[PDB]
Structure formats: structure tokens, C-alpha cells
Amino acid sequence: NLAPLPPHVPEHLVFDFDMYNPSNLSAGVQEAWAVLQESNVPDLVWTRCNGGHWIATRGQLIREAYEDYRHFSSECPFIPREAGEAYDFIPTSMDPPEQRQFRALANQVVGMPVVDKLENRIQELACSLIESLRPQGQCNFTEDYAEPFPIRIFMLLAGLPEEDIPHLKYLTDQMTRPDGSMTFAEAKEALYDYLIPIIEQRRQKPGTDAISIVANGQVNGRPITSDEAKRMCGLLLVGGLDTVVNFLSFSMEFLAKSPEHRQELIERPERIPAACEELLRRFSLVADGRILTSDYEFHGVQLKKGDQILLPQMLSGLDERENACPMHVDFSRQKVSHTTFGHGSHLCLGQHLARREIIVTLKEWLTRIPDFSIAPGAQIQHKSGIVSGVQALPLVWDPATTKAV
Ligand code: HEM
């Protein structure tokens, strides 16, 4: 379903990419997107799918667009428009200078100091989940570890009941990888029906959980509103539930297939940090955009006020101009260039938590279960959207090759 080409678009710039169902999906998600970087594709293209929108295909353009909030506003950051429209998360649907005050608070909740404090639980929970898995010689990594690990830590941070997971998780998924089961607004509403009561309850009787800190926070010398708090917490949930979860499955899927990569990490543990970076570049998975605040001419292409443009954070690091042999995983690259956690003022606050969750998992999984692989005849399927994912990850191993700790 291609929408009719708007008048201002040179037909030579058309490239019908469907962000929700790329063509090469079988080959893998990062691979399906990278077709945008082939020689036959202009740097800046227009796609008639999902209502028509621009796509910047190169690291350089993406970084520029992200730096430029004057022209490229966060107001309507999701494609399609109804989604970017219904989207009112804070600080994500705001531009500087307004953005800054909400950012500062959100930072209080997810920042470094919080990670440092939660470190022992992270380490505790991972060791526990793995040890539990170890003797089975088989899981569903996606359901068995990728989901529980990050979510339980979040539920811990937020002081929310583990029981709300399934419900919460469904709504989150609807937003990033729309099912067709519910629209963005319907989905936004449900997450909101959820948060409302809790926030109220934490304004009256504050805790030490993330929600309490948000609900009772100060912004521009005055108290945050209830609606504002609802809107921050809404974002925290989606990052908490939907990002780390998917990243881990790509990395684990990759590790299950590359014995040599596993080994390197086992023998030269000092490399874990460099490898985490490489994996964040290679298995990057977020694609959001911006809205043109006016007519603007960008790299010789005429953009019209109101046009949306996708600036796929995923693409910067896969771009050959940025990284030689981009599709190749090399833990010892001189420079790992990516924008996996974004670029500009909206640079991801949860990056610290995310990095801690990844490193712990690698170090801990490798220690106990150094040798594993994908279940014979399982066919791994990726999914595309704002946040790309893995559907299921059937792994098998010989219990006799594991090590208890
Ligand atoms: C795999 C890990 C993650 C990746 C790849 C990721 C990616 C991103 C991206 C690309 C952005 C900027 C979007 C934009 O400019 O439109 C962002 C922003 C944000 N992320 Fe992360 N995210 C991850 C994990 C997390 C976690 C664990 C949290 C905290 C629970 C989180 C919280 C946030 C927040 C609060 C923002 C907004 C910052 C602002 O608007 O100034 N993210 N993330």
C-alpha cells in the first residue's frame, strides 16, 4: 500500500521501503535495512509506504539531522504519522530548551548512580537465571532469559508487580512492532490506564522507587504535573521492557553461531567491553524519526514543512563509509562508530543500565555455558519496526560441558 507521490518529490528519489516489513527479512533484520545502503540507492530517499516519508540512509545525514532540532523536531518522532501524532512521551516528544528539564529528572531515575546501586541485584539475578537454565541443556532464550532479566530488574527499579509483566509487555510491543490488533493511541491509552492510579498513589504516599521520584519531581522550579509524570513513566516502561530484551537475543543468536567469538571472550575477558560496543554497532535495532518544522533544503533535496523523515539509528554503524566491512563482527576494530543509543540532545539515558545488563549477561553466560548452539532445524525469525526483535531463540547445549559456580 503505496501512497501517491507528493508533488515536491523527484521520482528518482523514490525507494519503497516498508520499515515494518522490509524485503530481505529472512536474511536478518540489519541485513534487510542495509539494502538502503547499496550503490543504487540515493543517500536521501522517499518511500510511499506507511503514508510516505523520507529516509536518510547514511551516518553523516543521520547525525546531522539529529543535531539540528530547529529543522528536525521530535514533536512527531514516529512513523506512521498517527503514531508520531498520538505519541506524547516526555522527554522524547520535546525539543530543547524544554526537553532539558525533563531529561534532568529522568536522569535521576535511570542514570549512572542508580546503576552503581543496582549492580549487585543485576549480577545476582543473572547468575540465578542462568544457573537455573544450565542443567536443562535447552531453553527459549527469548522467553527464558531475554524477557525476565531486564524486566524483573525494571519492575524492581519501578517498584511494580512482576504480575503486570505480561500485560505491560503486550502494550509495549504494540507500540514498537505494531500487530494490527490495536492502534498506537488505543495502546497508549491502556498503558496510561495502568499508570494513572499508581502515580496518584505515589503522590500521596511516596516511596523510593522510580515512579515515586518521578511523580514528586521538580521541573523549572515547580512541581511536575500528574500528566507530565504519566508521560515520563510511559517512556521509561517502553525502554525498560522493549530494548534490552531484543538486543540480547540478537547478540545471543550471533554467539550461538560463532564459536570463535565465544572463545575470544572466554580467554581475553578484558575485551568484553570492546565487544559489547561492537555488538551494539552490529546488532543496532532502533529506527525513529523527526518532523520538518518548515521548508528546508538538505543535501540538495527539498523538504517541505510537515514531511516526516526516518533517521534510522540502526544504519549509522552499518554504513561502509563509517565502518569498513560493516556486516563483519570484529572485537578489535580500532574505532566502533555507531549511533545505537541515538545522537544529539535525545541521547539515551538508559545506556548505562543497558551496558551493565549486556556485560553481565555475556560474562555470566559464558562462564557457566561456554558451548551452545541453535537448536537443529529451528529457523530464527526477526521482526522489524521502531524496535526490531527476534521471535524465538531455541538454544541447545550439552549439560556435561557446563560449569557450576
Ligand atoms: C538496547 C538498549 C537501548 C537502546 C538501543 C536504546 C535506544 C535509544 C534511542 C535510539 C534513543 C533516542 C531516540 C530519539 O532520539 O528519538 C533513546 C532514548 C531514551 N532511552 Fe534508550 N535505548 C535502550 C535502552 C534504554 C533503557 C534500558 C532505558 C531506561 C529504562 C532507556 C531510556 C531512554 C530514555 C529515557 C530516552 C530519552 C532521552 C531524551 O529524550 O532525552 N533506554 N534510547
Tab-separated table of C-alpha atoms and ligand atoms in Angstrom:
chain	number	residue	atom	x	y	z
A	1	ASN	CA	0.000	0.000	0.000
A	2	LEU	CA	1.901	2.898	-1.551
A	3	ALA	CA	0.539	6.413	-1.058
A	4	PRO	CA	0.539	8.731	-4.091
A	5	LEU	CA	3.793	10.650	-4.569
A	6	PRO	CA	3.579	14.225	-3.288
A	7	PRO	CA	4.385	16.951	-5.810
A	8	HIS	CA	7.704	18.043	-4.292
A	9	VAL	CA	9.315	14.604	-4.657
A	10	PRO	CA	11.611	13.837	-7.609
A	11	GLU	CA	10.571	10.380	-8.798
A	12	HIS	CA	14.269	9.450	-8.982
A	13	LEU	CA	14.312	9.657	-5.202
A	14	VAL	CA	11.567	7.086	-4.706
A	15	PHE	CA	12.593	3.852	-2.950
A	16	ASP	CA	9.649	1.936	-1.476
A	17	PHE	CA	10.993	0.672	1.838
A	18	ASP	CA	8.473	-0.665	4.378
A	19	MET	CA	10.064	-0.211	7.815
A	20	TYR	CA	7.548	-2.730	9.216
A	21	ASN	CA	8.141	-5.395	6.583
A	22	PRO	CA	11.426	-4.951	4.758
A	23	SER	CA	12.106	-7.161	1.785
A	24	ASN	CA	15.078	-9.243	2.928
A	25	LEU	CA	13.607	-10.115	6.342
A	26	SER	CA	14.716	-13.750	6.054
A	27	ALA	CA	18.377	-12.783	5.755
A	28	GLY	CA	18.112	-10.954	9.082
A	29	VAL	CA	16.821	-7.547	10.151
A	30	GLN	CA	20.051	-5.490	9.972
A	31	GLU	CA	20.608	-7.033	6.519
A	32	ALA	CA	17.103	-6.140	5.255
A	33	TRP	CA	17.697	-2.482	6.222
A	34	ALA	CA	21.222	-2.317	4.735
A	35	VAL	CA	19.739	-2.708	1.248
A	36	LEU	CA	19.114	1.039	1.734
A	37	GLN	CA	22.904	1.456	1.582
A	38	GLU	CA	23.524	-0.255	-1.767
A	39	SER	CA	25.055	1.719	-4.665
A	40	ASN	CA	21.721	2.080	-6.489
A	41	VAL	CA	20.171	3.993	-3.553
A	42	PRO	CA	20.449	7.790	-3.213
A	43	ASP	CA	21.518	8.967	0.299
A	44	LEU	CA	18.087	10.507	0.920
A	45	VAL	CA	15.039	8.675	-0.413
A	46	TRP	CA	11.236	8.859	-0.279
A	47	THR	CA	9.134	5.770	0.445
A	48	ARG	CA	5.473	5.548	-0.397
A	49	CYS	CA	4.817	3.030	2.351
A	50	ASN	CA	3.396	3.821	5.756
A	51	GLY	CA	1.981	7.016	4.300
A	52	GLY	CA	5.056	8.416	2.527
A	53	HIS	CA	8.143	9.730	4.320
A	54	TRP	CA	11.828	10.465	3.776
A	55	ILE	CA	14.584	8.098	4.956
A	56	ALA	CA	18.212	9.233	5.461
A	57	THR	CA	20.459	6.234	4.627
A	58	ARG	CA	23.881	7.470	5.797
A	59	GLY	CA	25.639	8.005	9.083
A	60	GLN	CA	26.504	11.582	8.107
A	61	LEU	CA	22.954	12.637	7.256
A	62	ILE	CA	21.523	10.875	10.335
A	63	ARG	CA	23.927	12.606	12.682
A	64	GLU	CA	23.265	15.968	11.035
A	65	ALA	CA	19.516	15.603	11.165
A	66	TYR	CA	19.759	14.616	14.835
A	67	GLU	CA	21.917	17.603	15.730
A	68	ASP	CA	19.523	20.050	14.020
A	69	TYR	CA	16.381	20.150	16.242
A	70	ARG	CA	15.489	23.544	14.723
A	71	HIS	CA	14.569	21.876	11.418
A	72	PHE	CA	14.029	18.297	12.527
A	73	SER	CA	11.712	18.310	15.502
A	74	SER	CA	10.923	15.487	17.918
A	75	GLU	CA	7.263	16.504	18.047
A	76	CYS	CA	6.155	13.640	15.756
A	77	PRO	CA	9.036	11.147	16.030
A	78	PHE	CA	7.135	8.003	14.987
A	79	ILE	CA	6.060	6.804	11.565
A	80	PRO	CA	3.317	6.476	10.591
A	81	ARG	CA	2.062	9.961	11.473
A	82	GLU	CA	-0.905	8.843	13.609
A	83	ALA	CA	1.658	7.136	15.861
A	84	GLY	CA	4.080	10.099	15.921
A	85	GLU	CA	0.952	12.177	16.484
A	86	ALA	CA	-0.528	10.132	19.324
A	87	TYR	CA	2.976	9.970	20.833
A	88	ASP	CA	3.390	12.330	23.776
A	89	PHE	CA	6.157	10.700	25.797
A	90	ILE	CA	8.480	13.010	27.729
A	91	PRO	CA	11.212	13.914	27.078
A	92	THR	CA	11.097	12.232	23.680
A	93	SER	CA	8.393	14.334	22.027
A	94	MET	CA	10.084	17.604	23.102
A	95	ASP	CA	12.889	19.774	21.772
A	96	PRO	CA	15.415	21.842	23.699
A	97	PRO	CA	15.163	24.006	25.703
A	98	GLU	CA	12.033	22.430	27.194
A	99	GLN	CA	13.453	18.905	26.792
A	100	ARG	CA	16.311	19.647	29.191
A	101	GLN	CA	14.332	19.945	32.444
A	102	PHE	CA	12.500	16.659	31.903
A	103	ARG	CA	15.780	14.989	30.866
A	104	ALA	CA	17.474	16.049	34.102
A	105	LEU	CA	14.782	14.301	36.152
A	106	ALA	CA	14.608	11.116	34.089
A	107	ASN	CA	18.352	11.012	34.622
A	108	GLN	CA	17.803	10.984	38.392
A	109	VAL	CA	15.898	7.742	37.944
A	110	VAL	CA	17.992	5.794	35.348
A	111	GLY	CA	21.441	7.438	35.484
A	112	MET	CA	24.834	6.075	36.488
A	113	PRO	CA	24.350	6.378	40.266
A	114	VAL	CA	21.256	4.163	40.086
A	115	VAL	CA	23.137	1.519	38.072
A	116	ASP	CA	26.036	1.523	40.530
A	117	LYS	CA	23.466	0.992	43.279
A	118	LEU	CA	21.620	-1.814	41.467
A	119	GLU	CA	24.695	-3.664	40.332
A	120	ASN	CA	24.561	-6.487	42.890
A	121	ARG	CA	20.967	-7.320	42.023
A	122	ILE	CA	21.776	-7.331	38.321
A	123	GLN	CA	24.642	-9.791	38.936
A	124	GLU	CA	22.504	-11.763	41.379
A	125	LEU	CA	19.539	-12.091	39.059
A	126	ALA	CA	21.624	-13.097	36.048
A	127	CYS	CA	23.628	-15.734	37.914
A	128	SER	CA	20.357	-17.095	39.281
A	129	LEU	CA	18.541	-17.303	35.931
A	130	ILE	CA	21.487	-18.949	34.177
A	131	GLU	CA	22.204	-21.484	36.932
A	132	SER	CA	18.557	-22.408	36.736
A	133	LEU	CA	18.834	-22.924	32.967
A	134	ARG	CA	22.218	-24.659	32.862
A	135	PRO	CA	21.329	-28.278	33.734
A	136	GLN	CA	18.391	-28.365	31.245
A	137	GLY	CA	20.650	-28.256	28.200
A	138	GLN	CA	17.967	-26.170	26.444
A	139	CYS	CA	15.855	-23.011	26.566
A	140	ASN	CA	13.896	-20.405	24.615
A	141	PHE	CA	16.412	-17.601	25.311
A	142	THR	CA	13.808	-15.029	24.317
A	143	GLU	CA	11.278	-16.258	26.861
A	144	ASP	CA	13.667	-17.896	29.330
A	145	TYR	CA	16.209	-15.105	29.814
A	146	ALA	CA	15.957	-12.098	27.492
A	147	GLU	CA	12.493	-11.180	28.809
A	148	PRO	CA	12.799	-11.986	32.520
A	149	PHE	CA	16.273	-10.499	33.122
A	150	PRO	CA	15.789	-6.892	32.085
A	151	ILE	CA	12.088	-6.801	33.042
A	152	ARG	CA	12.429	-8.051	36.591
A	153	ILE	CA	15.236	-5.538	37.096
A	154	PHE	CA	12.926	-2.840	35.771
A	155	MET	CA	9.977	-3.975	37.887
A	156	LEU	CA	12.403	-3.812	40.811
A	157	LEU	CA	13.508	-0.272	39.907
A	158	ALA	CA	9.960	0.949	39.366
A	159	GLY	CA	8.564	-0.916	42.377
A	160	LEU	CA	5.885	-2.566	40.161
A	161	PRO	CA	4.442	-6.099	40.498
A	162	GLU	CA	6.026	-8.872	38.432
A	163	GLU	CA	2.461	-9.951	37.718
A	164	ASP	CA	1.899	-6.952	35.458
A	165	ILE	CA	4.648	-8.127	33.119
A	166	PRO	CA	2.575	-9.993	30.550
A	167	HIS	CA	0.042	-7.189	30.244
A	168	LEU	CA	2.665	-4.459	30.234
A	169	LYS	CA	4.791	-6.245	27.697
A	170	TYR	CA	1.878	-6.684	25.278
A	171	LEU	CA	1.163	-2.970	25.150
A	172	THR	CA	4.858	-2.139	24.738
A	173	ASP	CA	5.149	-4.463	21.751
A	174	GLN	CA	2.109	-2.918	20.122
A	175	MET	CA	3.909	0.442	20.091
A	176	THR	CA	7.226	-0.615	18.505
A	177	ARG	CA	6.183	-3.581	16.372
A	178	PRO	CA	2.502	-2.832	15.710
A	179	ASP	CA	0.459	-6.012	15.388
A	180	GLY	CA	-2.665	-4.581	13.794
A	181	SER	CA	-4.513	-5.708	16.935
A	182	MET	CA	-4.582	-2.170	18.302
A	183	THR	CA	-3.696	1.308	17.065
A	184	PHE	CA	-0.954	3.450	18.697
A	185	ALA	CA	-3.485	5.629	20.550
A	186	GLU	CA	-5.504	2.685	21.867
A	187	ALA	CA	-2.199	1.187	23.072
A	188	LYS	CA	-1.057	4.469	24.591
A	189	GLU	CA	-4.383	4.670	26.400
A	190	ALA	CA	-4.101	1.256	28.014
A	191	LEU	CA	-0.571	1.837	29.307
A	192	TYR	CA	-1.989	5.062	30.629
A	193	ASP	CA	-4.999	3.413	32.320
A	194	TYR	CA	-2.349	1.356	34.074
A	195	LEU	CA	-0.007	4.116	35.274
A	196	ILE	CA	-2.607	6.678	36.382
A	197	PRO	CA	-3.717	5.010	39.625
A	198	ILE	CA	-0.144	4.214	40.644
A	199	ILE	CA	1.097	7.754	40.133
A	200	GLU	CA	-1.800	9.074	42.225
A	201	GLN	CA	-0.896	6.635	44.987
A	202	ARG	CA	2.783	7.684	44.853
A	203	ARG	CA	1.992	11.409	45.035
A	204	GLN	CA	0.121	10.799	48.300
A	205	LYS	CA	2.409	8.137	49.787
A	206	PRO	CA	5.813	8.394	48.142
A	207	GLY	CA	8.298	5.541	48.003
A	208	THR	CA	11.928	5.351	46.886
A	209	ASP	CA	11.016	3.639	43.581
A	210	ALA	CA	11.489	5.344	40.185
A	211	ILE	CA	7.808	6.219	39.877
A	212	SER	CA	7.693	7.958	43.272
A	213	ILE	CA	10.774	10.000	42.336
A	214	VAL	CA	9.158	10.976	39.017
A	215	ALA	CA	5.674	11.695	40.408
A	216	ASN	CA	7.036	14.062	43.072
A	217	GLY	CA	9.807	15.668	40.940
A	218	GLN	CA	10.696	19.332	40.351
A	219	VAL	CA	10.805	20.835	36.841
A	220	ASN	CA	11.546	24.512	36.204
A	221	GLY	CA	11.331	25.289	39.906
A	222	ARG	CA	7.758	23.983	40.190
A	223	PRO	CA	6.269	20.540	40.797
A	224	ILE	CA	5.795	18.183	37.831
A	225	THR	CA	2.145	17.654	36.863
A	226	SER	CA	0.390	14.299	37.008
A	227	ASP	CA	0.043	14.238	33.201
A	228	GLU	CA	3.746	15.004	32.753
A	229	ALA	CA	4.624	12.202	35.189
A	230	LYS	CA	2.278	9.823	33.405
A	231	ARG	CA	4.118	10.699	30.192
A	232	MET	CA	7.651	10.215	31.521
A	233	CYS	CA	6.757	6.886	33.154
A	234	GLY	CA	5.185	5.842	29.871
A	235	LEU	CA	8.569	6.199	28.188
A	236	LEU	CA	10.545	4.514	30.989
A	237	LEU	CA	8.373	1.432	30.597
A	238	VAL	CA	8.970	1.050	26.826
A	239	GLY	CA	12.784	1.433	27.209
A	240	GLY	CA	12.696	-0.837	30.282
A	241	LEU	CA	10.621	-3.573	28.613
A	242	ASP	CA	11.401	-3.436	24.893
A	243	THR	CA	15.066	-2.507	24.204
A	244	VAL	CA	17.456	-4.678	26.204
A	245	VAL	CA	15.113	-7.589	25.692
A	246	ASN	CA	15.639	-7.630	21.898
A	247	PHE	CA	19.285	-6.601	21.903
A	248	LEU	CA	20.217	-9.701	23.972
A	249	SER	CA	18.554	-12.119	21.544
A	250	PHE	CA	20.467	-10.730	18.537
A	251	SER	CA	23.743	-10.935	20.441
A	252	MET	CA	22.949	-14.409	21.780
A	253	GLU	CA	21.863	-15.615	18.337
A	254	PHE	CA	25.153	-14.325	16.977
A	255	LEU	CA	27.152	-16.004	19.789
A	256	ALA	CA	25.424	-19.397	19.322
A	257	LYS	CA	26.736	-19.259	15.735
A	258	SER	CA	30.315	-18.125	16.293
A	259	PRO	CA	32.353	-20.453	18.459
A	260	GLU	CA	35.421	-18.378	17.742
A	261	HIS	CA	33.786	-15.254	19.160
A	262	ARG	CA	32.747	-17.040	22.332
A	263	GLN	CA	36.312	-18.264	22.892
A	264	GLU	CA	37.954	-14.930	22.437
A	265	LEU	CA	35.707	-13.574	25.179
A	266	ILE	CA	36.414	-16.540	27.445
A	267	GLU	CA	40.174	-16.259	27.198
A	268	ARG	CA	40.549	-12.476	26.976
A	269	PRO	CA	37.817	-11.155	29.307
A	270	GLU	CA	39.304	-7.659	29.241
A	271	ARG	CA	37.742	-7.474	25.779
A	272	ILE	CA	34.132	-7.806	26.917
A	273	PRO	CA	33.650	-4.009	26.945
A	274	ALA	CA	35.048	-3.551	23.432
A	275	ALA	CA	32.904	-6.476	22.213
A	276	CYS	CA	29.758	-5.030	23.814
A	277	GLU	CA	30.381	-1.930	21.716
A	278	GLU	CA	30.862	-3.936	18.510
A	279	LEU	CA	27.665	-5.902	19.130
A	280	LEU	CA	25.789	-2.651	19.840
A	281	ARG	CA	27.063	-1.448	16.396
A	282	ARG	CA	26.401	-4.723	14.508
A	283	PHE	CA	23.053	-5.546	16.097
A	284	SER	CA	21.685	-1.952	16.394
A	285	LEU	CA	17.873	-2.046	16.360
A	286	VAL	CA	16.137	1.312	16.797
A	287	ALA	CA	14.686	3.371	13.943
A	288	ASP	CA	12.727	6.542	14.749
A	289	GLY	CA	12.425	9.972	13.030
A	290	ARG	CA	11.615	13.671	13.079
A	291	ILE	CA	9.200	16.212	11.555
A	292	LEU	CA	10.146	19.138	9.333
A	293	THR	CA	9.220	22.378	11.074
A	294	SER	CA	9.429	24.176	7.706
A	295	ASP	CA	10.617	24.089	4.108
A	296	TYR	CA	14.276	23.239	4.215
A	297	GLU	CA	16.867	22.208	1.723
A	298	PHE	CA	19.011	19.372	2.973
A	299	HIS	CA	21.872	17.947	0.904
A	300	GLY	CA	20.210	19.309	-2.231
A	301	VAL	CA	16.790	17.753	-1.516
A	302	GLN	CA	13.813	19.966	-0.887
A	303	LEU	CA	11.977	19.054	2.258
A	304	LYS	CA	8.560	20.525	2.942
A	305	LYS	CA	7.301	21.624	6.369
A	306	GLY	CA	5.404	18.688	7.906
A	307	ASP	CA	7.250	15.960	5.984
A	308	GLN	CA	8.407	13.216	8.357
A	309	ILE	CA	11.854	11.688	7.860
A	310	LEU	CA	13.084	8.382	9.326
A	311	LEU	CA	16.679	8.705	10.704
A	312	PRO	CA	17.444	5.025	11.404
A	313	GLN	CA	19.846	4.941	14.350
A	314	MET	CA	20.465	1.376	13.169
A	315	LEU	CA	22.055	2.497	9.881
A	316	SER	CA	24.924	4.756	11.022
A	317	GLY	CA	27.213	1.886	12.143
A	318	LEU	CA	26.304	-0.440	9.262
A	319	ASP	CA	27.412	2.278	6.791
A	320	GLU	CA	30.612	1.328	4.973
A	321	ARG	CA	31.775	4.970	4.972
A	322	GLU	CA	31.851	4.739	8.792
A	323	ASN	CA	32.923	1.155	9.371
A	324	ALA	CA	34.952	-0.969	6.943
A	325	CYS	CA	33.320	-4.413	6.459
A	326	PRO	CA	30.225	-3.399	8.430
A	327	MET	CA	28.478	-6.760	8.446
A	328	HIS	CA	31.554	-8.414	9.954
A	329	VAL	CA	31.875	-8.730	13.727
A	330	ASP	CA	35.409	-7.762	14.858
A	331	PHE	CA	36.037	-7.250	18.574
A	332	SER	CA	39.334	-5.486	17.897
A	333	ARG	CA	38.254	-2.705	15.485
A	334	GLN	CA	40.243	0.497	16.049
A	335	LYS	CA	37.032	2.566	16.056
A	336	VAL	CA	33.483	1.301	16.601
A	337	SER	CA	31.306	4.070	15.135
A	338	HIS	CA	27.566	3.840	15.841
A	339	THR	CA	24.555	5.880	16.989
A	340	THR	CA	22.792	2.898	18.617
A	341	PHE	CA	21.742	4.972	21.636
A	342	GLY	CA	20.935	7.941	19.397
A	343	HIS	CA	22.573	11.250	18.718
A	344	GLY	CA	22.071	14.837	19.796
A	345	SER	CA	20.049	16.089	22.720
A	346	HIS	CA	17.988	12.905	22.849
A	347	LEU	CA	20.950	10.608	23.604
A	348	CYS	CA	19.649	7.629	25.552
A	349	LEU	CA	19.783	7.947	29.328
A	350	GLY	CA	19.335	4.205	29.969
A	351	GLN	CA	22.519	3.420	28.027
A	352	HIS	CA	24.384	2.839	31.291
A	353	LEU	CA	21.842	0.358	32.600
A	354	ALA	CA	21.729	-1.329	29.167
A	355	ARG	CA	25.512	-1.692	29.005
A	356	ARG	CA	25.603	-3.184	32.533
A	357	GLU	CA	22.911	-5.705	31.606
A	358	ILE	CA	24.782	-6.807	28.453
A	359	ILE	CA	28.213	-7.137	30.012
A	360	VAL	CA	26.879	-9.122	32.994
A	361	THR	CA	24.982	-11.486	30.705
A	362	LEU	CA	27.973	-12.182	28.454
A	363	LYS	CA	30.410	-12.677	31.317
A	364	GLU	CA	27.986	-14.828	33.267
A	365	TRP	CA	26.553	-16.928	30.437
A	366	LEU	CA	29.980	-17.687	29.024
A	367	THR	CA	31.244	-18.733	32.439
A	368	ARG	CA	28.579	-21.369	33.023
A	369	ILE	CA	27.651	-22.327	29.458
A	370	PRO	CA	30.675	-21.740	27.246
A	371	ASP	CA	29.419	-24.009	24.472
A	372	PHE	CA	25.981	-23.790	22.934
A	373	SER	CA	24.292	-23.557	19.571
A	374	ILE	CA	20.909	-23.078	17.898
A	375	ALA	CA	18.507	-25.998	18.050
A	376	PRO	CA	18.750	-28.142	14.920
A	377	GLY	CA	16.069	-27.180	12.400
A	378	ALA	CA	14.901	-24.079	14.277
A	379	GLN	CA	14.581	-21.184	11.828
A	380	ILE	CA	15.175	-17.819	13.579
A	381	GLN	CA	12.846	-15.003	12.592
A	382	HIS	CA	13.424	-11.318	13.017
A	383	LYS	CA	10.761	-8.638	13.197
A	384	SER	CA	11.035	-5.022	12.064
A	385	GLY	CA	9.541	-1.809	13.443
A	386	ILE	CA	10.656	1.101	15.613
A	387	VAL	CA	12.494	-1.502	17.694
A	388	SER	CA	13.381	-4.689	15.797
A	389	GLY	CA	13.338	-8.066	17.512
A	390	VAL	CA	13.766	-11.835	17.479
A	391	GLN	CA	10.618	-14.005	17.659
A	392	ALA	CA	12.087	-17.035	19.499
A	393	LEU	CA	15.610	-18.317	20.153
A	394	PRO	CA	15.714	-22.086	20.698
A	395	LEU	CA	19.206	-22.990	22.026
A	396	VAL	CA	20.637	-26.437	22.968
A	397	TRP	CA	23.793	-27.439	24.830
A	398	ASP	CA	25.406	-30.474	26.461
A	399	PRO	CA	24.964	-30.169	30.231
A	400	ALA	CA	28.247	-32.051	30.654
A	401	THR	CA	30.131	-29.089	29.148
A	402	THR	CA	28.660	-26.585	31.605
A	403	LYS	CA	30.330	-25.299	34.762
A	404	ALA	CA	28.505	-24.517	38.014
A	405	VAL	CA	29.642	-21.504	40.025
B	1	HEM	C1	19.376	-1.836	23.931
B	1	HEM	C2	19.314	-0.769	24.654
B	1	HEM	C3	18.703	0.570	24.215
B	1	HEM	C4	18.801	1.199	23.049
B	1	HEM	C5	19.427	0.697	21.744
B	1	HEM	C6	18.075	2.468	23.168
B	1	HEM	C7	17.958	3.401	22.175
B	1	HEM	C8	17.552	4.703	22.391
B	1	HEM	C9	17.448	5.709	21.345
B	1	HEM	C10	17.939	5.489	19.909
B	1	HEM	C11	17.050	6.844	21.935
B	1	HEM	C12	16.762	8.222	21.315
B	1	HEM	C13	15.505	8.285	20.445
B	1	HEM	C14	15.284	9.592	19.730
B	1	HEM	O1	16.227	10.417	19.618
B	1	HEM	O2	14.125	9.648	19.236
B	1	HEM	C15	16.805	6.562	23.338
B	1	HEM	C16	16.310	7.490	24.239
B	1	HEM	C17	15.925	7.177	25.512
B	1	HEM	N1	16.099	5.947	26.119
B	1	HEM	FE1	17.104	4.370	25.394
B	1	HEM	N2	17.545	2.586	24.448
B	1	HEM	C18	17.921	1.411	25.105
B	1	HEM	C19	17.662	1.151	26.435
B	1	HEM	C20	17.077	2.022	27.345
B	1	HEM	C21	16.839	1.736	28.751
B	1	HEM	C22	17.269	0.446	29.465
B	1	HEM	C23	16.232	2.811	29.258
B	1	HEM	C24	15.762	3.099	30.714
B	1	HEM	C25	14.828	2.241	31.187
B	1	HEM	C26	16.019	3.774	28.179
B	1	HEM	C27	15.518	5.046	28.331
B	1	HEM	C28	15.578	6.068	27.399
B	1	HEM	C29	15.153	7.437	27.625
B	1	HEM	C30	14.552	7.931	28.947
B	1	HEM	C31	15.321	8.102	26.469
B	1	HEM	C32	15.011	9.576	26.155
B	1	HEM	C33	16.085	10.636	26.386
B	1	HEM	C34	15.699	12.042	25.936
B	1	HEM	O3	14.670	12.158	25.219
B	1	HEM	O4	16.480	12.987	26.224
B	1	HEM	N3	16.611	3.280	27.022
B	1	HEM	N4	17.088	5.235	23.587
